Amino acid sequence: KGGAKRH
Amino acid sequence: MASMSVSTASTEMSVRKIAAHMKSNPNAKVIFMVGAGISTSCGIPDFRSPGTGLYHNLARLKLPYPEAVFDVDFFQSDPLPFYTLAKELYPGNFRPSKFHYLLKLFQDKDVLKRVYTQNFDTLERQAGVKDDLIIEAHGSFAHCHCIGCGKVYPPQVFKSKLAEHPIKDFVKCDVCGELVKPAIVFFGEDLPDSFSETWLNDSEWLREKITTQQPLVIVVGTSLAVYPFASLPEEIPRKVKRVLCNLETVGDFKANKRPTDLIVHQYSDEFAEQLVEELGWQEDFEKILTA
Ligand SMILES: NC(=O)c1ccc[n+]([C@@H]2CC(COP(=O)(O)OP(=O)(O)OC[C@H]3O[C@@H](n4cnc5c(N)ncnc54)[C@H](O)[C@@H]3O)[C@@H](O)[C@H]2O)c1
Numbered sequence: 001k002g003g004a005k006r007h
Numbered sequence: 008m009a010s011m012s013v014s015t016a017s018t019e020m021s022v023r024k025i026a027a028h029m030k031s032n033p034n035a036k037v038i039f040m041v042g043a044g045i046s047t048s049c050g051i052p053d054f055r056s057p058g059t060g061l062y063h064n065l066a067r068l069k070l071p072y073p074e075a076v077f078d079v080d081f082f083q084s085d086p087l088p089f090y091t092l093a094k095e096l097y098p099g100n101f102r103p104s105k106f107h108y109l110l111k112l113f114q115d116k117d118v119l120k121r122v123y124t125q126n127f128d129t130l131e132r133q134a135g136v137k138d139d140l141i142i143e144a145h146g147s148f149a150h151c152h153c154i155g156c157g158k159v160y161p162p163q164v165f166k167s168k169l170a171e172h173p174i175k176d177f178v179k180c181d182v183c184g185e186l187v188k189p190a191i192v193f194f195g196e197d198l199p200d201s202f203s204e205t206w207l208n209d210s211e212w213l214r215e216k217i218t219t220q221q222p223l224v225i226v227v228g229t230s231l232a233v234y235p236f237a238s239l240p241e242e243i244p245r246k247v248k249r250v251l252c253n254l255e256t257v258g259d260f261k262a263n264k265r266p267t268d269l270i271v272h273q274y275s276d277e278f279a280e281q282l283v284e285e286l287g288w289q290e291d292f293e294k295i296l297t298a
């Protein structure tokens with residue numbers, strides 16, 4: 001999926 | 008709605024390369040990947056900027072730092088900073104930019120494959136972009152759910168709270184008791200499943216067009232610093248032309264630049280006006296503007 005919303 | 012060029016340099020010639028690629032491939036379509044840059048001309052206050060009324064109301068409320076307002080553990084401890092942000096940002100309080108209306112023109116000409124957006128304005132939709140062509144990668148206010156059981160709630164129940172003086176007595180779920188929030192993707196949550204699923208179909212579409220006509224992906228008004236969105240431009244096929252319309256060179260276009268990459272340093276609204284002129288679509292644009 002790409003992972004969680006982050007910097 | 009009036010714009011000007013960012014500097015003395017003209018970008019009309021770069022922009023003319025873009026129009027030249029669409030005149031050569033006339034049933035080809037474009038994928039756009041956009042962020043907060045495209046909504047700046049609409050007057051949407053940035054919650055990170057001192058100097059906005061929002062920033063100072065959030066600081067008064069003890070928000071420790073701006074992005075805590077999008078942090079699930081903070082919201083659970085204290086939902087008021089989030090509710091105050093919502094009251095100021097809620098759709099319907101701004102109008103779409105000339106860039107937003109460019110997307111709707113590209114749809115009317117059937118040259119829009121999809122827009123991927125990091126913004127939770129929904130100005131693409133308000134401007135009349137179809138549901139099937141939009142991916143709101145960070146969610147929106149248009150759905151709401153219990154953070155504890157997932158029970159569904161109409162968006163109007165959260166809305167009605169924001170019209171109260173002062174804001175108190177936050178929405179709570181009638182099955183589990185936890186807070187109900189908008190379907191905005193907060194830091195630390197996953198994106199909606201349609202994000203990955205549609206990029207999967209569109210990645211496959213991009214590869215298959217290079218072996219037949221040729222597609223274009225244009226990234227606009229984003230710093231490409233928030234993941235996983237910002238992994239997209241690196242995943243564009245090697246042989247699919249990439250354009251960046253951004254005040255600065257960022258992301259994969261500064262790290263790992265490609266011979267066919269086209270960089271246009273220009274305000275998104277000015278980009279829109281130059282493109283529409285270099286396309287010949289002045290007339291249908293003008294008419295969309297005055298409705
Ligand atoms: N409308 C909104 O939903 C909204 C508003 C304010 C902040 N955000 C945050 C923004 C965000 C995603 O980062 P992102 O999109 O990359 O924001 P960003 O604020 O980090 O970067 C925007 C980028 O666009 C550039 N820019 C600013 N104005 C213009 C213009 N007129 N024309 C062309 N380029 C311009 C600028 O150089 C900058 O790199 C999230 O974490 C949000 O929380 C969203």
Ligand SMILES: [Zn+2]
Pocket residue numbers: 153154155156157158180181182183184185
């Ligand atoms: Zn519940």
